[PDB]
Each structure stands twice: as structure tokens, then as C-alpha cells.
Amino acid sequence: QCVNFTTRTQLPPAYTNSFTRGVYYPDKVFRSSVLHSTQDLFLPFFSNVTWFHAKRFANPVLPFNDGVYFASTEKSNIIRGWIFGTTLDSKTQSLLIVNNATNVVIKVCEFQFCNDPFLGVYYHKNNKSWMESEFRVYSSANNCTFEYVSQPFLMDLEGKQGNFKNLREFVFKNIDGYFKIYSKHTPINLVRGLPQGFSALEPLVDLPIGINITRFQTLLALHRSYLTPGDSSSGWTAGAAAYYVGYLQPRTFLLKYNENGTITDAVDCALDPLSETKCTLKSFTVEKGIYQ
């Protein structure tokens, strides 16, 4: 059922701090303990990210410019997919991605998306369990010049299915007609903010789609129970999650690979003058003195 409600709420965009976030492997080369420096698009340190709350219909249009960061602190994986493109009204070609228990369908068709797309899961039906039910994400798929499926990509980490929360961390990059994705998931105990640590995001897939992308939708998969009346948009208004949005731009990071080849720490050459000193001097410890 591709029908929606006129509005839910004028989303208050609460912000939070991305302490040490947006660090991902910029290359496909293993490196031992070295201090490399790459001119790749990262998320600048200590940047305000648009903390969107799931319980209150956080599924707006968001300009996807020069790549966009993404996280999700949640259990049971409320938010699933994304809807990219530059026109979104089937007039021009546009991307589409989903995620569910069948497989993560990735398509580039002249889709006609629904105003409130998500994945409804009518559960406790004839088996006292859960089973994906709804597919109200789009209506038409007339023209198409791409497709992909790999497997149901729901990376529920160990921990007996949500002792802590599953923190997805995702980078989507789109330059010179190549859609690039990096991902990692780590467990934490913090409920509202983000922890104090350095996370490195490995690549997972590239797309030869070359489609002009300027937005994304972040399918939240609205569902609470199979007895919630609604107009296919509201009714399933229950989200115990949150998802973050962060832009990317040129940031000449200075990456510190340890002996194990992992990016232990990083330095941003525009966060502050001291970090620019650490960059020009090309180290992490700066002795007393004056540097140009």
C-alpha cells in the first residue's frame, strides 16, 4: 500500500558530537607501522552530526553531497535501507537499496518511490515469531539499467542478539561515477551519545552506476505490532533507535597504522593549529618549540 499521511512532526534536528569518527581505509594496501597521509574525503573530527530520532518519523530528504556518513545505535536493527537519486520521481534515473531477511536488493531503475517507504514486519502470525511482511517502498520499476543481490546483509554481531546495541557505521561515497561503501559494526554500552574510541571502516562494495545522487531517505522500517491501524505511514510509530548523518569533504588525514596494520589513531590537518603542526612535522608527538 503506497499511501502516506500529510505530516507527523516538524523534526527538531538535535545535534551531537562526532568525537573520533569517519576514519576508513582510504586504500587497498596493507601497511605496517607507518604514518601515512591521504587526501581522501573523511568526516572532520569534532563535527556536529544531525542526530535523528527514530520514534518521531525521522525519514526526511537529506542532501547527499560529496559522500555522507551514517551510524545507528539500536538493537533488532530498526533502520534497514536507503533511497538515493537526484529526482526521486521516476522522471530521471535514480538508485535504490534495501535490506531485509531475504537479500539486500540493490537497483538503479526509474523508480516511483513511496512518500513513506519502510519495511513493515507483521509478526506473531501463525508461528509466534517474526516474518517480514511489507514492501511499500516503491510502485513502478519501468526502466532499469542495473541490479544486484548478495545475501541478507543484517550483520547482527555476537552478544546473544542485543545484550549491548549494534552500532552500524557506514560511509557512502559517490565520485566520478563510482558508488563506494565502507562499513563496520562495534558494540558499546552508551545509550545516547557516541563512545571514546577510533573506528576504521573497511570497504564492502563498489557500484558502476554513475548516477547523479543528491539525496537519500534511510528506510527506517516502521513497525511495532500487527495491530496498529494506520495509513501505511503512521500507526507503526515506534522506534527505539537513532541514526546519525555526517557530511564528507577533503580532509588530508594523517593515518597511524600500527604493527597489526590497523588504523589505531588519526589526525586531521584542519581541526586546529596543533593538529596542523602534527601534520607538517608528520608525527604524533610534538616537542616544545615553534613550527611553521
Place this chain on the structure above:
Amino acid sequence: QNAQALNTLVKQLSSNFGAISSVLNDILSRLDPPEAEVQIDRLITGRLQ
């Protein structure tokens, strides 16, 4: 000072100097000598400087 001079001498081996790659084994194994000679010569001039 000695260690820094040697380190920058090593690090200068990873520069293109205008060539298509900073390693000779990717120029020789991807270009016929007639037009690989110009890239090898660019690297020669840069590394010699």
C-alpha cells in the same frame, strides 16, 4: 639530521615526477619501450635530482 636525510631520500622513491607511476616495474610491464622511454626518463631526472 643524517637519519632524516636518508629517510627523505627513501621517500623520494614514491614520487611520480610527472610519470604515470612511481615504480619502474609498472611502466615497463605496461608500455612498449618507444613510449615507456619518456616515463622512465622522467623518473630518471627526478630521482637523479
Place this chain on the structure above:
Amino acid sequence: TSNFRVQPTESIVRFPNITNLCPFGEVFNATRFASVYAWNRKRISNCVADYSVLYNSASFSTFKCYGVSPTKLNDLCFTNVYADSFVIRGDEVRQIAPGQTGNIADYNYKLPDDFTGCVIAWNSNNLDSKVGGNYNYLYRLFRKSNLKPFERDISTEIYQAGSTPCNGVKGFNCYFPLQSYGFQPTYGVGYQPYRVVVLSFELLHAPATVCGPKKSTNLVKNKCVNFNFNGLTGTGVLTESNKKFLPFQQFGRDIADTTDAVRDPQTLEILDITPCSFGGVSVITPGTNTSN
């Protein structure tokens, strides 16, 4: 006097184990090449990239390559390869090249400056030129600015000529984005259509499974060999190491950008490249007057 360096005792080739044959036969001999305003992105992959049937063959009017020698194409393993097939005019044959500005080189198809890869062209009088009128092939003229390389545009709206707003199907000072073609066998050079396919590689950054029928020689260790891993030549003394390569990490470099670690494309173990035990020789010498 001179320098002592050990010589390689063996030659080694280590390619992925594959037996498929690449779609070049289908790609080049397709039924009807698409219009130049919307070309095709056919991701050839996981096949023995035999370019012998490409360079030893005939009827290819122009087969010239940029950055890759045609005779080395049989020895290079590509991360990905793409076939951009379309039809152009005789005056556009030069325009399918890096730089070389023209009309279609600035309107509907552009190549980057590096363009690791090349193009193949041949006439299209025998298969396209009919006296009935080949208006089925078109191309865009201007989209208020220049386009970007390797990006398509299949939005068949009405774009204004400029300085005046219109709508509908026709307006004064408001044109139509496309322009038709007229291929007929009465045509000649500069007018007869040409069938152009564009190959674009991506070399020596990431692990690769697309390259020619070079026979993978057995693997030897602890001896000076002239190894060849996916086309990465070089002398070394292969040993075993414990460098924790991540699944997407093929190679491993040092400060001088020389690979000091490699992974077998057949048995995914972490090797340890190291050049031979070279050195310099000094010659202690009493004066030749006194002794020899």
C-alpha cells in the same frame, strides 16, 4: 669497483585459477549497438582476458591505447574492465580519445585525462546504413553546460535554448535535447556511422580476477625468483610472514612504495617479498707496480 647482486634462479607466474572466456565476442559482435546519448556499461569480469583475438584480428580501423601497450594486455590483471559500446560519426572518431576536443567529445561522451584503457572502432555501413533512414540513433547537444565523463543522461524532457521560458512540446527559443541521425548507404567517410567500443581498466591497486591465459607456474620460496603476482613483476626471495592482510587487502607496500608483502591469488597466504642479498664489492689492492 662494482656491485654484487644475486641473480634470479627461476621465473614464477601466479594468476588466479580461472577458465572462463570473456564476453568480447558478444560485446563487439552485438546485434544493435545502443545510441551514443546512452551507452552501455557491461562489467566484464571473472574470465580469461584474451586480447589475441583483439589485436591479431582485423577490420578494427583504429585500435590505439593510452597507458597500456596492446602486447602487454595479455600480461596485466585488471581489477575491473568496462565496455562502453556505441555508434558515432566519422568526424567523431577522433573525438573518442582523451583530450581532442570536438562536438561529441564535449556533448555526450567524454574521457578522463589518464584513461587507463582504450577504444576500438570500425565502420557501420554494412549493418546500420539503410536507405530507409536511421533516425533511431540520436545524441544530446547541450545541457546548459558540459557534462561529466562516464555519466549517462536519459531524461527526455524539453530543455530551453536559453533566455526564454517555455514548456509543452515546442516553444520559441526553446529547443529539443536530442538530434537525430541519417545513416544511409549513400553516405561516405565523415558521415558513415562507426561502431565504437571503449575499454577502461583499473590497474594495480586492488585484488583482481580478470586477465589473460598466462599459465600459473609452480610457487617456490626462500629462493631468488622473477615472480609475477597478477602482473606485478619484480625479483625477490619469497618467504612466509604474519602480516594480517584484511580480506580486501591484496598488496603491501613500504615507504618507498615497493611491495614487501603479497598474497597468493590461489592459496590466500601472506608471503614476504624481499630482494636478493645484493651488496657492493671492494677490491683491496697493493700497487700494481708491487703485485697483481
Place this chain on the structure above:
Amino acid sequence: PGQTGNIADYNYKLPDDFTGCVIAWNSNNLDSKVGGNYNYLYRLFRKSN
């Protein structure tokens, strides 16, 4: 010199330096006969170049 092709790699090759040059002109008036000019041929491959 250079400019790889079929005959440039099969039956006639020039060195890389090639001090000296070439002259060419059409041969329709003296060779092209409808009878069939099979009197001229060329090699293709001898297991190598």
C-alpha cells in the same frame, strides 16, 4: 618506427632510431586490375615476431 599494427609486426619492422625515411604513393593505376592481383602476398606469423 613504433606505430604497431599488423604488417609493422609481421613482415616489416623499422628500428627505434631509424635515421632515414619513407616515401609512399597510390598503386591503383599500375597494380589494381580486375583480373586479380594474387601475385603479391605477405607472411602472418612464425611462432613469434
